[PDB]
Design a protein around this ligand. Structure first.
Ligand SMILES: O=c1ccn([C@@H]2O[C@H](COP(=O)(O)OP(=O)(O)O)[C@@H](O)[C@H]2O)c(=O)[nH]1
Ligand SMILES: [Mn+2]
Ligand SMILES: [Mn+2]
Lengths: 248, 248
């Protein structure tokens, strides 16, 4: 008697992007939406969804995607802050960057615009690879993008809707959810990249008690599986400790 | 001017279960659907979806959920083989077991009916915890369920639609995707349980070369993060090796 739905291995999306944002400030988010539509993210190419933090912290960096993903219909799902704005590069640029990455390295799972190169040799300085306009300067670069990374800045990242990666359930807050996503991508057997897709990010990092707390939680959690590793993020290196590193 | 959708933190599902099966044989799947409807999985409570392998191996154990989950609307998503059938315990018993688990340990992320207890002390025998009717006997038990486990038998497992866990991308095939899902649940900071929900699984243990291939791949992959661990599955122990265990 039940009538089942048979599901085939086919990408039946017709929208290229689901653009999801973590929204607290209506004015910043309206700026973002206007800029995306101006730079080619029109209704036949993209839909916009917002995790609604306008009245309080209903969601945080590690939980918002689990609610957004089921509602997305696009091929690629962007998870970005409310305070990015497209300024020059647009829809065709982003498609071309993603398709180029698929060709270069089909093991990618997460892509962003700023992050730290994968497994830096030199732990005496923080490794960075990005191209962006932000509070540190307009149209600036570190390193060379595109390139493989071990962490991404949370202002803008993306994954394929049919090949997602999830954030941890045992951390909560508004720091380190970009690195956590990259690390889970490695556990799942894929990779993270910073691509070259220049946009403007207005926000400033907040090195507050939550930042210090989550830095310690990241080290306590990840040292179990990456003992001795020094994890680079745009916000600074994190010596995870553990194992033989604890001698001294 | 885009019109965004604002998303709130609420479970809007009206169906309790999305029952997803990996299907190659129509007669076995018809028998499954008949049994689920008989034992209380009516259209007001459950929908049924099939990863369609009737014509070829379009999906395999580690990929099928990524196509199924977007199509599910139920609170809990069951992933089962086509050759399980309900025979005594039904809809109300499963709901009661999941609600009890949620009360006992809110950290759970995946549940199944047969698996190996979490971190067994005694590696001289394979740890098992199950209650099932299968090729090894009708109405049989090992161990004591419900209990936390480090692996689950793939014949039937479930997760919350809104708190999923993903299988790896860098393995493919039809063995060890129950253990892989439990290990990724640990990486995500949650837990796996075998619950008491008796059903009939009529698969055979029919041996293939892919079983040994995936056993080796699982050891090569997980030894990186779990060096020295002996991972128990109802199909046998797997010494992952790695680290100090390599000393002869
Ligand atoms: O080449 C294969 C082998 C198996 N299966 C599916 O993988 C699952 C496990 O198969 P089966 O139940 O026959 O194995 P058993 O439980 O006897 O070990 C079932 O859902 C099958 O439909 C598949 O799609 N292709
Ligand atoms: Mn920001
Ligand atoms: Mn079976």
């Amino acid at each position: 008697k039940p009538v089942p739905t048979y599901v085939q291995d086919k990408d039946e999306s017709t929208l290229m992007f689901s653009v999801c944002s973590l929204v607290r400030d209506q004015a910043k988010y309206d700026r973002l939406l206007e800029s995306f539509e101006r730079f080619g993210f029109t209704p036949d190419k993209a839909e916009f969804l917002a995790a609604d933090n306008r009245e309080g912290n209903q969601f945080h960096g590690f939980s918002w995607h689990k609610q957004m993903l089921p509602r997305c219909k696009g091929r690629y799902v962007i998870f970005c802050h409310e305070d990015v704005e497209l300024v020059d590069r647009g829809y065709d640029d982003l498609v071309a960057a993603i398709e180029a990455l698929e060709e270069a390295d089909p093991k990618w799972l997460v892509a962003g615009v700023a992050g730290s190169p994968w497994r830096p040799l030199n732990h005496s300085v923080t490794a960075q690879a990005l191209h962006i306009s932000d509070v540190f300067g307009n149209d600036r670069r570190r390193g060379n993008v595109p390139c493989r990374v071990e962490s991404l800045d949370e202002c803008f990242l993306l994954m394929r809707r049919l090949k997602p990666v999830l954030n941890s359930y045992d951390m909560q807050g508004f720091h380190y959810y970009g690195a956590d996503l990259c690390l889970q991508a490695e556990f799942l057997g894929g990779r993270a990249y910073a691509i070259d897709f220049h946009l403007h990010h207005y926000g400033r990092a907040i090195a507050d008690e939550n930042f210090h707390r989550l830095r310690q939680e990241m080290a306590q959690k990840y040292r179990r599986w990456f003992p001795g590793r020094i994890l680079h993020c745009v916000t600074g290196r994190v010596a995870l400790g553990g194992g033989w590193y604890e001698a001294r």
